[PDB]
Design a protein around this ligand. Structure first.
Ligand SMILES: CCC(CC)O[C@@H]1C=C(C(=O)O)C[C@H](N)[C@H]1NC(C)=O
Ligand SMILES: CCC(CC)O[C@@H]1C=C(C(=O)O)C[C@H](N)[C@H]1NC(C)=O
Ligand SMILES: CCC(CC)O[C@@H]1C=C(C(=O)O)C[C@H](N)[C@H]1NC(C)=O
Ligand SMILES: CCC(CC)O[C@@H]1C=C(C(=O)O)C[C@H](N)[C@H]1NC(C)=O
Lengths: 387, 387, 387, 387
């Protein structure tokens, strides 16, 4: 039966560790898929860690130039949380070099984009087989979330971007019901930019903290309603949460336009706490090192820079990376509110390291009503590997 | 309960990628079964990739002369689609150096042929254990489909060939109901030739595009009815779809007799689109390189050479191979028509390559109502291996 | 619900291959348990291959003196038929250097004997945990079947031997009902000898063809009734079916006493066909090479040497070994008679080979109403290994 | 439905082997998690072996200083009993360098402590996801049982220690009901010490034989009632069961205070047999070698030193280690009394051995009404490894 994800997100004063795969460390001797862009999405029975394999393993020659991003070998596969992305416990999702996934209370929906940049196709699967399709609509890398999509009473929604990664682009919202696409929307956001969004459900509306790859050091937000009516802009808070980013001191927040004179970024997330917001970010304002998450007061609605809580999960002496949001189905947590959880991708190898390869590890963190102590659950692998 | 595969095949304007195992690439460091003659068949809950192991793994000495075709070590085993043919996730089917499989809505039926060429036996299994048997009837390699067989309301049908691979032979159609053989038919087709057929269900009749290994560059077709009454000949279309094959320019199609002065071939498939036909074929008219699929107008009934669609899945600079047909049970796809899907075997190693071994990789492609862009999802392994 | 194994065995004119694991070949590169004394037993949903691990894998230093027979490392584990005895797909049964197993229509019963020779204990498990126990009763290696035990309407029976492997000994029959021992019997058979029996169900009575290790070249039989009343002696037939054995020419059969002047043997089996008997045996009368099975007319009741069928499964140029009997539950085969099946252990390494290790492979063969052609599905591994 | 663990423990005259994983031996060539602090806990369908991985495998460089105890890589994972702690059959529990687990008749509850010593957090999970949390309450290594916790009619209880491992500390009892903490207790035991308790259910009250790391050679006991009212002290018996420990001759038992002038220890267990007690202990009074278990008459209530039974499981020429208690749910054993079972950790490597690494193997032993013969089912690995 369908999963009602109508409830509001729970209010947490801190997050507790869910799991840690140790994929790379383990990957030093075991048969682990060299991957990247990992993420967690739960069904009403278990959570699984979805990844993107480079079509190869670690400590193997085929692990070589796996820094290339897109290729025909990458395929979306999944395993139960905590388990490393290994071959023998791996479940095949879809052929993809960019994917997204979500359960709805019955079957798993997956969407894997692959093919040429100028004509890539996004194949949606439902129950272990493709049901519908989307063709690149703007001939420039049809890419999607790299994060869990959202299902609310049988209808799962997600966001996609087609255009250049730098300047302006075209963003759309897709809505489905059993693998089948049932309507979509064009997002008007000129001057703005949306990439690899992180969503979660909160009151029958889908909230996403995306990635402005153009002119944004402050991340963009977008609330989606069940009838494609939407709302978009940037997370207000007078604090930037992208990387590379400028300092907090010299940064004025903006609920409306992008702020900062930086032009890149990394995938991140953020949760709406009433008006307050929990925002993840790399300790380093420049590199992809360390991961932290702060709660700015009234930061979801005001240019606030007033924090009441902070907590680190990866110190600045350890490689960080991507971050995503999802929720613990009420049918698992037992709460009467959607427990807010998130993950951190820990990339190892090129470019910041001397190795023929590039992969990443992850760790999962969930809500909690208590405040959880700063610490580091970093990758741990000793590079370089045997090669 | 039994699966009604009475519906007609759906009409597609193009195919979308289902999966890609990367068995060989992965096989460079992992424990993957050196195999060949792979194929996909679905049950009303999942699709599995059936293969033929050489009784050994990759990057191992026992991978040696695995180019030999038949031996006592080869056994039919299966894994969920997309997953590579690995040992730890492998399910044992039957002892075979030539097999076929199909689900019927309850249990899986498998038929594995093995033993000596002059007296090989085809052991049929049902539910994880052999139920009936067939003895070679013409003492010359009792071989079968290497493709998914067809079940329509409790009765699964398939085709077999006993005789020389070159000149004339003896073809038969077998019909069963729960592992148990319930009647059969002799196919009169003198001058004609049938090998490794590819079937699928379309309107309660079983359609197969087989392989003329004698004098056919154009492939043979055969519509089987539920009471063994059948119909046979070649796919009409003024275009040859076998390899080796002559050019299209100098080829007149023939709904009746084989055409072309070539005497070999490879396993292929084809779908009946109304009167139109989707036909797969290697880009190369000579070697086993590249894979493509065209839709010739009215090509199922007329000597047509009028195509309205084309699409590549493996460019001519990459190894191709076998191709097969199957369908997505309505109980998975949710359609009201049997979604047409197919796979491409990508052989690597001897003979076209310098390696002690020979194996292959596969990729799955399904129906779709939209037109899907040309591209290549080729093997990817870097040969030779460590040996 | 309980499985009625009251029916008679089906009458076969030949056997067809069920499976072949290729454990050793595969074991050359994969992680396979170095084992020995393998056997198959089925439940009403699947058959599994039970083995005895040496507590180590192949191509490893811990594979060393694994020719030793008994040790504290050996444990009974199982995997679905056909699958090799690998670690990652392995199910733990019991701690044993001698075991037996059987399902009853609900849960799996296993009995693993281990410990010191003068006080070994046989731990019986039911449903994945030990329920009852048996202590050595004659202080000289408490050993059992190494073959599937028999369950008939909730009560599973098996046989055990305590005494010297050479001269006289003490044999007993054990009967249980849900892991719990419910009565037993002492077998009076002075001058006779019983070891590693092979049983199967036939008309609510348990038939076993055991192994006379004392003075028997002709094997012993014993029909057990549901109330421990039994019947014992040797398989009549004027043909010996043990190894080492004397020729057939100079051998007079004996339904009563052991025959032949040989003092060793190997584990074998035999089926009661009306009055006729199917008897397995190594082609070689001296070494453990090749496996064959003949059907002597009226050989279950008369000193017959009149065969009507023969069939080889492993030619005399390939290593053979142990053989066992079991049946395909009616709830799998669908018959109205218990399909007779058997397996052949193919031992490789010491003593007949130059390797630090010793293990074995198996192959499964089942009933069938047709006659199946001679052939060889031998091990296949290339020794010696990397060591 | 909830599991009533109200019954009394069964009365055994000896224990029989349940399983043996051979993790290390196997770990010489296979992909086994280098671990430590293993333990068994059963649900009403199966028992699983829970462990603590060092976030790495064996025969790998990441196996290095795994003697360190606490780190961010260690995570609690589990596998079915007998199976080794391998990657491909491993189930992820929680992020922990100190854990405890128990089923309640529906879902599995796990509690993994991790993080910094001065602020570690104990994350409790229920059904495959964290439900509640506990923060270090005395800033000095928040650690727990390393043994199965106890559930009685929906409420699972366990014990934790926060303070120095040497002198005085703070002990607490936690009670939950579906991952959610429902009340707790402070244990007054000045001069006393409690660490890594071993509990089991006996008459609706939780009995634990813990570890006095301060001044105890005799172990402490504590009976917990369903309303947090408790009872504490040391196991009476005039025999010490800790290591290091003084001799039995010069040791007077004490139901009240710690006895002996030793200041360390190892994790152990003990069962209440009426008034009698089964107590496990290392043969060696000094090192962690050999494992034995005795039954002292009236030793649960009197300073007794009168034994009626003894039995060894690991001779003094083989490495021993940790020991724990649990029970076989009535829904598995079928008894009308909770069968008493236990396990022995067999540590190999540093410190007692010359290897870069440190791990351990285990073996499981259960109740039984018969007396079981002394023997040794020691590790078996040949060190040092390939490194
Ligand atoms: C093509 C632009 C896109 C969004 C900015 O780039 C991403 C950035 C990445 C990055 O910043 O590390 C890695 C992702 N693998 C990549 N996505 C694809 C499809 O290549
Ligand atoms: C024996 C003739 C048969 C059909 C033409 O050959 C096939 C052709 C093959 C090929 O053309 O590559 C490979 C198949 N493995 C082989 N089948 C068997 C049983 O050996
Ligand atoms: C101890 C005598 C017993 C029965 C004859 O020996 C068997 C013969 C064997 C053999 O002949 O190869 C191998 C078995 N592993 C062994 N059983 C045990 C427990 O060691
Ligand atoms: C910190 C004290 C604690 C209880 C005495 O130490 C244990 C003793 C151990 C030991 O004596 O071998 C190993 C355990 N891994 C360790 N627990 C932790 C959390 O490090």
């Amino acid at each position: 039966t369908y999963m009602n994800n109508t409830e509001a997100i729970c209010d947490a004063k801190g997050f507790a560790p869910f799991s840690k795969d140790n994929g790379i460390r383990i990957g030093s001797r075991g048969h682990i898929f060299v991957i990247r862009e990992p993420f967690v999405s739960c069904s009403p029975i278990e959570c699984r860690t979805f990844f993107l394999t480079q079509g190869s393993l670690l400590n193997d020659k085929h692990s070589n130039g796996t820094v290339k991003d897109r290729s025909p070998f990458r395929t979306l596969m999944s395993v139960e949380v905590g388990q490393s992305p290994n071959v023998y416990q791996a479940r095949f999702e879809a052929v993809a070099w960019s994917a997204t996934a979500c359960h709805d209370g019955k079957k798993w929906m997956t969407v894997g984009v692959t093919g040429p940049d100028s004509k890539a196709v996004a194949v949606i699967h439902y129950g272990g087989v493709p049901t519908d399709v989307v063709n690149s609509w703007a001939g420039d890398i049809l890419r999607t979330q790299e994060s869990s999509c959202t299902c609310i009473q049988g209808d799962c929604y997600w966001v996609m971007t087609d255009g250049p990664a730098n300047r302006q682009a075209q963003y759309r919202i897709y809505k489905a019901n059993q693998g089948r696409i049932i309507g979509q929307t064009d997002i008007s956001f000129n001057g703005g930019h949306i990439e690899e969004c992180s969503c979660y459900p909160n009151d029958g509306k889908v909230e996403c903290v995306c990635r402005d790859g153009w002119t944004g050091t402050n991340r963009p937000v977008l609330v989606i309603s069940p009838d494609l009516s939407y709302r978009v802009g940037y997370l207000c808070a007078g604090i930037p949460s992208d990387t590379p980013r400028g300092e907090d001191t010299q940064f004025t927040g903006s609920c409306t336009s992008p702020m900062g004179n930086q032009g890149y970024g990394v995938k991140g997330f953020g949760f709406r706490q009433g008006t307050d917001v929990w925002m993840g970010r790399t300790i380093s304002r420049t590199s992809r090192s360390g991961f932290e998450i702060l709660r700015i007061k009234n930061g979801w609605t005001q240019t606030s820079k007033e924090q009441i809580r902070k907590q680190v999960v990866v110190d600045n002496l350890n490689w960080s990376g991507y971050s995503g949001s999802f929720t613990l189905p009420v049918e698992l947590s037992g709460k009467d509110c959607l427990v807010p959880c998130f993950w951190v991708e820990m990339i190892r190898g090129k470019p910041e390291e001397k190795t023929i390869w590039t992969s990443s590890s992850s760790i999962v963190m969930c809500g909690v009503d208590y405040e959880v102590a700063d610490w580091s659950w970093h990758d741990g692998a000793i590079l370089p590997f045997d090669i």
